[PDB]
Amino acid sequence: TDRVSVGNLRIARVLYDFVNNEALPGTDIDPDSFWAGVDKVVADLTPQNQALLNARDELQAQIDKWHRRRVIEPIDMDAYRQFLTEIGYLLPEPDDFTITTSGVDAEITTTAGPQLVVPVLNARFALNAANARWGSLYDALYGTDVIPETDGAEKGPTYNKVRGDKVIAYARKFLDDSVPLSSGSFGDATGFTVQDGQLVVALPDKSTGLANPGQFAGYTGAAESPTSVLLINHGLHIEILIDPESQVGTTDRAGVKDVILESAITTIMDFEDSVAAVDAADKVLGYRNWLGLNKGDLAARVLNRDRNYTAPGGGQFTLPGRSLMFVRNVGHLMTNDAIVDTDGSEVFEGIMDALFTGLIAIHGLKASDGPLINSRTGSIYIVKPKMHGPAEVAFTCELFSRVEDVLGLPQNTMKIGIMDEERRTTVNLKACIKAAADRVVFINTGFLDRTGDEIHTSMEAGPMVRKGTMKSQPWILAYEDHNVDAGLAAGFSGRAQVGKGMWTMTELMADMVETKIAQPRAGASTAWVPSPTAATLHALHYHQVDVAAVQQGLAGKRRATIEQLLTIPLAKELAWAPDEIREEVDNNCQSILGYVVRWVDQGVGASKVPDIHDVALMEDRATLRISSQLLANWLRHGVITSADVRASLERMAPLVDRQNAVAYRPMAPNFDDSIAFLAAQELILSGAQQPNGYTEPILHRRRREFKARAAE
Numbered sequence: 177t178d179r180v181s182v183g184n185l186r187i188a189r190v191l192y193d194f195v196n197n198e199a200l201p202g203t204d205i206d207p208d209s210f211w212a213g214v215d216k217v218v219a220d221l222t223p224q225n226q227a228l229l230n231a232r233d234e235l236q237a238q239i240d241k242w243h244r245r246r247v248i249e250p251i252d253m254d255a256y257r258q259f260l261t262e263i264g265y266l267l268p269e270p271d272d273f274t275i276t277t278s279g280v281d282a283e284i285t286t287t288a289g290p291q292l293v294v295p296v297l298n299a300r301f302a303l304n305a306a307n308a309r310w311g312s313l314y315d316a317l318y319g320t321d322v323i324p325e326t327d328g329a330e331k332g333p334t335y336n337k338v339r340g341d342k343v344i345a346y347a348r349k350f351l352d353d354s355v356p357l358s359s360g361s362f363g364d365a366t367g368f369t370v371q372d373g374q375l376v377v378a379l380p381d382k383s384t385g386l387a388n389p390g391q392f393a394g395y396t397g398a399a400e401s402p403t404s405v406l407l408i409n410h411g412l413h414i415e416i417l418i419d420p421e422s423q424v425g426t427t428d429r430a431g432v433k434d435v436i437l438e439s440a441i442t443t444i445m446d447f448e449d450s451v452a453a454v455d456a457a458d459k460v461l462g463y464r465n466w467l468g469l470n471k472g473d474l475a476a477r478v479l480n481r482d483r484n485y486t487a488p489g490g491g492q493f494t495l496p497g498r499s500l501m502f503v504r505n506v507g508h509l510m511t512n513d514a515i516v517d518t519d520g521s522e523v524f525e526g527i528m529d530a531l532f533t534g535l536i537a538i539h540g541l542k543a544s545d546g547p548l549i550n551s552r553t554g555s556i557y558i559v560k561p562k563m564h565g566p567a568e569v570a571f572t573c574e575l576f577s578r579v580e581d582v583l584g585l586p587q588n589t590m591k592i593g594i595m596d597e598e599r600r601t602t603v604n605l606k607a608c609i610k611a612a613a614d615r616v617v618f619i620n621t622g623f624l625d626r627t628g629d630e631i632h633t634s635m636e637a638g639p640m641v642r643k644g645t646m647k648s649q650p651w652i653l654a655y656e657d658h659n660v661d662a663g664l665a666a667g668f669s670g671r672a673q674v675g676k677g678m679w680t681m682t683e684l685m686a687d688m689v690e691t692k693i694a695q696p697r698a699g700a701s702t703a704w705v706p707s708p709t710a711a712t713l714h715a716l717h718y719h720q721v722d723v724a725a726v727q728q729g730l731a732g733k734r735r736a737t738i739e740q741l742l743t744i745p746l747a748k749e750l751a752w753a754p755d756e757i758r759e760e761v762d763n764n765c766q767s768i769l770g771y772v773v774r775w776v777d778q779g780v781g782a783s784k785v786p787d788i789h790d791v792a793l794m795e796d797r798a799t800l801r802i803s804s805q806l807l808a809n810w811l812r813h814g815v816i817t818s819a820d821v822r823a824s825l826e827r828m829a830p831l832v833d834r835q836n837a838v839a840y841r842p843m844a845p846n847f848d849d850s851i852a853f854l855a856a857q858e859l860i861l862s863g864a865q866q867p868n869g870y871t872e873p874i875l876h877r878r879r880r881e882f883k884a885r886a887a888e
């Protein structure tokens with residue numbers, strides 16, 4: 177075949193060559209020694225990996241049975257809790273403790289702000305994200321619906337001056353709210369100057385300084401006629417660009433060209449749910465972009481340099497010009513044929529990701545082409561998705577420890593971001609944090625994945641509420657508060673990120689600005705945004721809310737109970753009319769079809785996908801998990817029939833075809849000839865039997881089938 181023999185392993189040649197020729201050089205790791213370590217690590221840790229996956233199945237089987245032997249009625253929580261305890265699903269909560277994680281960057285320990293997640297397979301999205309640390313507020317305001325597109329202020333072919341003036345006014349108000357002048361409003365300023373190391377803002381009738389002079393960070397150009405002024409508020413920078421000879425400056429009272437906000441402080445380069453990677457060739461494409469980012473030489477457009485400034489008193493300094501990068505590895509479930517053993521068995525993908533993304537991350541720890549690209553404190557930041565409970569966290573930590581050895585890195589170099597997106601983690605969260613107390617740099621929550629696990633876990637209990645309803649259910653609201661509480665009680669404030677979920681509605685920025693503020697108000701030091709534009713707008717929220725103070729106020733509170741976490745989202749008696757049932761079916765079938773068609777046919781794992789009401793959504797694979805589990809749950813409990821599912825699929829497919837009006841090939845009307853349509857159908861009809869409702873086993877198979885057909 178086309179493989180390389182290393183002990184028990186048969187490595188795909190494309191991968192072997194990539195690692196030898198591109199990833200190993202410059203790391204001073206012995207190539208033979210590295211490969212020996214890969215073989216050694218796979219052999220030692222594969223059996224525990226498999227053991228953990230079987231224990232998931234065993235717990236799920238026992239809960240399915242607990243439900244099936246019970247008839248209607250209200251749950252009875254005390255017995256249900258007792259049962260979860262007896263089977264080892266719910267573990268005892270350990271004594272209070274403080275995380276000890278060290279060598280972590282300021283961007284993570286102290287700075288509160290937006291966090292971007294982008295597919296690592298998309299070199300252009302990755303580059304834009306890396307460069308999104310500093311973003312234009314005027315661009316973000318002019319370009320989105322934050323400034324309403326009403327009469328006179330619509331966006332046209334060229335610059336609309338009514339719209340631009342509303343932009344200017346919006347930004348002036350933000351300045352007044354965030355960096356108050358001792359007297360007057362930024363709205364009336366005529367100029368900015370720096371005298372005696374103090375910012376002087378010229379007004380028509382007088383001059384004035386900042387109410388808090390400490391918020392003056394510095395400037396560029398002459399003190400007496402600066403090109404920009406730099407401010408700071410809640411640890412985030414704001415840059416006022418001054419240029420009377422610009423498109424916009426020429427219309428402005430102080431000649432202000434733009435307001436730049438430090439925006440995406442950190443970015444997660446994703447190998448998991450936003451990318452479709454089903455073989456060695458796909459994984460190498462991903463590893464190669466991760467390498468270019470870390471070497472600082474990726475070009476699809478290039479990576480930004482650091483930003484130079486003059487301190488208030490006259491000296492010089494610099495600020496980071498790039499988002500600090502995490503990588504999200506895949507989780508414990510999937511195997512990938514990038515490496516097989518002598519029996520032909522595929523190796524666990526999570527284990528490989530640990531080895532390869534960690535090897536590659538070494539490059540971001542040293543000089544590019546050219547200070548070093550990423551972590552100056554010596555850490556590698558790995559986000560680990562889809563873990564179930566503290567034994568699985570303990571395993572990932574042991575995995576990172578073994579990889580560190582192989583790579584000659586000091587212990588605990590590899591830091592972990594624990595996603596709280598499975599129920600067994602949620603109800604054992606303190607213990608999960610404790611398992612990683614020397615490695616953890618964040619925890620976070622979300623809607624899509626965790627809800628999928630909620631539905632699957634209690635699949636046998638009865639019919640669940642609609643998808644849109646899930647978002648406001650008692651279990652999920654308790655889930656969110658419980659996550660923050662656990663983090664703060666573990667000492668995360670000043671040490672680690674407490675994060676919340678993605679805003680998926682890419683074009684509804686006015687709505688985002690209005691409602692996403694709830695997240696920092698709830699004490700989240702960070703939350704997920706779908707674009708650099710959204711990062712800039714979400715940065716506004718961190719100027720309005722003092723997250724550090726919020727966290728200090730939540731200190732010691734217990735605002736959710738285990739009971740609340742365990743409140744299954746069962747629908748009540750006769751909750752829906754026939755038309756509401758059909759709408760929900762249509763909604764879920766369209767979300768599956770819309771996503772699956774681009775995934776299976778084009779290997780795209782994220783994009784702006786129009787929903788059934790043609791609202792653009794940027795969701796990852798988790799949208800599949802929830803929609804398919806909901807449909808499967810409704811089929812399981814007689815809410816809908818299989819002919820109902822079929823009819824909806826048949827209706828939604830031509831609608832999706834139209835929404836994709838390119839290399840797109842229509843699903844209709846010959847459905848059984850479309851691999852992606854058959855994939856959509858399978859996810860639903862096999863939903864109940866997929867381990868924890870995971871969609872990867874089916875998706876990866878179908879995509880590999882499509883690729884094989886495409887090679888004939």
Ligand SMILES: O=C(O)[C@H]1CS[C@@H](c2ccncc2)N1
Pocket residue numbers: 293294295446449450597622623624625626678706782794795796798
């Ligand atoms: O991990 C999760 O649960 C998901 C929920 S939305 C998703 C995502 C959406 C868009 N781009 C990247 C990632 N992250």
Ligand SMILES: [Mg+2]
Pocket residue numbers: 449561597622625798
């Ligand atoms: Mg997820």
